[PDB]
């Protein structure tokens, strides 16, 4: 299928409690493979998936130096942002950035990403052209002018079209037995009486990878989107994910309801019913 590398940067100021924590985590699709945390006793880029451990010391030293430098960079950026919004040195604030690349089944660049947010609100984003910016407000326009003067978009374009894709392809090969393996959901329907008048039918998808899935109920072949309770896809802790969808049905009408499942690991889409 298609694949992505993405890095997720979070920096959080905490006045009176030291300097802002910086954490970077790296993902290929739904699999975390590295972390860096300035609050670790000995901050270092560390492996978080088995396939990355074979990288040599040069990889770990170089990514650690980048993160130690980004740490100071994001701390100075937080000071600048506080000024751009006329905020007090009193409060805590958050700077988030995500960047990386998507490739298709042929390993070819689909698109690149570089987006930032301040206090949970979108702040500035590299456009899909990897050459121009979208700023959310007059503060982000200051950043945009600064990044235009320093040719940041050109640096990002070179990284995203080169380094990023080259390393994503490398990771996909080194971890092909997991990263390029789709695990299908194990599916079943349970029945939970509510009253004499109705019961819950719950359609389960367990143990699947990656997290992308479609899970719906139909009544007489008509989608029940508005009447379905659909929990967020949730991690099991063994790399796989879980999800369920539930509908409330009148007693005796259970056979009018069908659960439909689509996922990359399935030979074909599934249709399930309550089997009493």
């Amino acid at each position: 299928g298609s694949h992505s590398m993405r890095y997720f940067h979070t920096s959080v100021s905490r006045p009176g409690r030291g300097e802002p924590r910086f954490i970077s985590v790296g993902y290929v699709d739904g699999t975390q493979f590295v972390r860096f945390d300035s609050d670790a006793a000995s901050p270092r880029t560390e492996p978080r998936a088995p396939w990355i451990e074979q990288e040599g010391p040069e990889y770990w030293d170089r990514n650690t130096q980048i993160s130690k430098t980004n740490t100071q960079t994001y701390r100075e950026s937080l000071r600048n942002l506080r000024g751009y919004y006329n905020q007090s040195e009193a409060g805590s604030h958050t700077l988030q950035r995500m960047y990386g690349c998507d490739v298709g089944p042929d390993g070819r660049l689909l698109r690149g990403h570089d987006q930032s947010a301040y206090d949970g609100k979108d702040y500035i984003a590299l456009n899909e052209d990897l050459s121009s910016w979208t700023a959310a407000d007059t503060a982000a326009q200051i950043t945009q002018r600064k990044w235009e003067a320093a040719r940041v978009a050109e640096q990002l374009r070179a990284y995203l079209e080169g380094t990023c894709v080259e390393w994503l392809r490398r990771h996909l090969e080194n971890g092909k037995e997991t990263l390029q393996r789709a695990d299908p959901p194990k599916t079943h329907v349970t029945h939970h009486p509510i009253s004499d008048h109705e019961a819950t039918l719950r359609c389960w998808a367990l143990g699947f990878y990656p997290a992308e899935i479609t899970l719906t109920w139909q009544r007489d072949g008509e989608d029940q989107t508005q009447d379905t309770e659909l929990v967020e896809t949730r991690p099991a802790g063994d790399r796989t994910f879980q999800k369920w969808a539930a509908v409330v049905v009148p007693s005796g009408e259970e056979q009018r309801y069908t659960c439909h499942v689509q996922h990359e690991g399935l030979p074909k889409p599934l249709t399930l019913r309550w089997e009493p």
Binding site: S24, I66, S67, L81, L95, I124, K146, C164, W167
Partner: peptide, 9 residues
Amino acid sequence: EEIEITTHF
């Protein structure tokens, strides 16, 4: 590999 950003916000 990560990218190194040296220009501040």
